[PDB]
Design a protein around this ligand. Structure first.
Ligand SMILES: CC1=N[C@@H]2[C@@H](O)[C@H](O)[C@@H](CO)O[C@@H]2S1
Length: 504
């Protein structure tokens, strides 16, 4: 048999007919079709009144999306007797084998029926439902001239990995609450279920800490290149968390330590050995900053920050960073990370950290490793300790240029086009581990606008999202590439300023 790899498409990028992404476990089509009309209602039914109430909220979110493009006013009804032309969302009789996030989605001529184990699974299944309707449905304004049809079809689905995440760096360049909400919303449509916020680094501190007000008053006032920066009040952070929660997305906040701490060091002189504030940094260098690993003031500061953040962040996890502590000795790093893990645990939070934080003697088997280095020795400690691992290889570093000539992005991991972002497996990063899942990381050294985010995340994130959801045995670039071409109008309709990658 003959085989080949993909080259660029001759003559440039290519960028009734559903386009489901990520690819579901099974999808069959039969004869006939369902028509969504102005008379349609969404019926919801759970196993008890409380579950029906949660399903009702999910139905209302769906109705809002459908109403925006159809111009209809679909309403939501608490009843297990759907009428002809209805969409029906239920958890009664879910197939337990599909887990919390799995669902069956069956479309007949008279009815759309989504059956799941949990409300979460009906939410994920609704992302598929939106992809079965014609392109146009994802418009934010009324579309005329399109019959709103769904083919007679049968889908069953569930994720391969539990953790399917996106990290946004808001320290290097700041993005508004609206901009952040929009990226969460877009990611949710591709079944991303985790959002990691890199809230602090050398060039800025982005979270209000009432006990240390100069973190904002001084530490938030810049960014890479010297723009004005910005920050989130605690109320704005809670608002983001609440918005994510409506999409069944866990928000994991990161306060990076003991390295990548210049902004804190520029806010409070007492955090530095000579008692003087550091100058703010607007360059892109890394590795040079450190908290004082043997000063009690350091641990007081960390405990105050953790206390306030834990109070407003319901996730059982806090990310304490731990990357590129090149101004911290190995002995001091071991000690520091063990101490801050104890502080986090005392506030009821488990710790996530970049490699090499798993090597800390103070880590527990409840700690999580985010393995970005993905070398043979990375996560040896994590594996021995029974720690879950989130993988972020080169292929998930979405801030990398697509090509040598990309107008934005970095290239210290090489270039990452849409193909590279697809053609990998979590076991390529680390073998013999408990892989919790995957996280796409969007660092923002070179991204200043919403259009820059869109351009780098789309279509790259779609590739990573399929790697997280779809089983390896069912992943194939030639398949995905053709499905992506078909999906392109939907990206356009959503207002995403995506890159038309010539490999697609
Ligand atoms: C972990 C990591 N720490 C660094 C980040 O601070 C940079 O922003 C990123 C840019 O790609 O490179 C490595 S990844």
């Amino acid at each position: 048999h003959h085989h080949h790899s993909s080259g660029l498409v001759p003559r440039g990028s290519h960028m009734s007919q559903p386009s489901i992404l990520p690819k579901p476990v099974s999808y069959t089509v039969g004869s006939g079709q369902f028509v969504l009309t102005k008379n349609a209602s969404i019926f919801v039914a759970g196993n008890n009144v409380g579950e029906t109430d949660e399903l009702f909220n999910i139905g209302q979110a769906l109705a809002k999306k459908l109403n925006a493009s159809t111009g209809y006013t679909i309403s939501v009804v608490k009843s297990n007797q759907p009428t002809a032309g209805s969409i029906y969302l239920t958890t009664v009789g879910g197939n337990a084998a599909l887990g919390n996030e799995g669902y069956d989605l069956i479309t007949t001529s008279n009815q759309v029926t989504l059956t799941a184990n949990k409300p979460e699974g009906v939410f994920r299944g609704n992302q598929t439902l939106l992809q079965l309707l014609p392109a146009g449905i994802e418009k934010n304004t009324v579309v005329s001239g399109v019959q709103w049809v769904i083919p007679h079809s049968n889908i069953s689905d569930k994720p391969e990995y539990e953790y399917r995440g996106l990290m946004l760096d808001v320290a290097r360049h700041f993005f508004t609450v609206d901009e952040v909400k929009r990226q969460i919303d877009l990611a949710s449509q591709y079944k991303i279920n985790k959002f990691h916020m890199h809230l602090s680094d050398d060039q800025g501190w982005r979270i209000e800490i009432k006990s240390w007000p100069d973190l904002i008053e001084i530490g938030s006032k810049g960014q890479v290149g010297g723009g004005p920066g910005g920050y989130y009040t605690q109320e704005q952070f809670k608002d983001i968390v609440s918005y994510a929660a409506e999409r069944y997305i866990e928000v994991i906040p990161e306060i990076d330590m003991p390295g990548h701490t210049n902004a804190a060091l520029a806010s409070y002189g007492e955090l530095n050995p000579d008692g003087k504030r550091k100058a703010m940094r607007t360059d892109t260098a890394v590795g040079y900053s450190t908290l004082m690993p043997r000063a009690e003031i350091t641990y007081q500061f960390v405990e105050d920050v953790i206390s306030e953040l834990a109070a407003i962040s319901p996730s059982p996890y806090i990310h304490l960073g731990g990357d590129e502590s090149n101004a911290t000795s190995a002995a001091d790093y071991d000690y520091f990370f063990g101490r801050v893990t104890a502080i986090a645990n005392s506030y009821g939070k488990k710790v996530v950290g970049w490699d090499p934080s798993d090597t800390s003697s103070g880590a527990t088997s409840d700690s999580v490793l985010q393995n970005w280095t993905c070398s043979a020795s990375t996560g040896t400690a994590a594996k021995a300790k029974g720690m879950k691992v989130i993988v972020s290889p080169a292929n998930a570093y979405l801030d990398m240029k697509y090509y040598s000539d990309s107008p934005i992005g970095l290239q210290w991991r090489g270039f990452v086009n849409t193909n590279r972002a697809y053609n990998w497996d979590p076991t390529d990063c680390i073998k013999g581990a408990n892989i919790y899942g995957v996280e796409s990381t969007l660092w923002t050294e070179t991204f200043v606008t919403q259009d820059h985010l869109d351009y780098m995340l789309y279509p790259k994130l779609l590739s990573n999202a399929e790697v997280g959801w779809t089983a390896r045995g069912d992943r194939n670039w030639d398949d995905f590439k053709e499905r992506l071409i078909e999906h392109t109008p939907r990206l356009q309709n959503k207002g995403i300023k995506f890159f038309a990658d010539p490999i697609v």
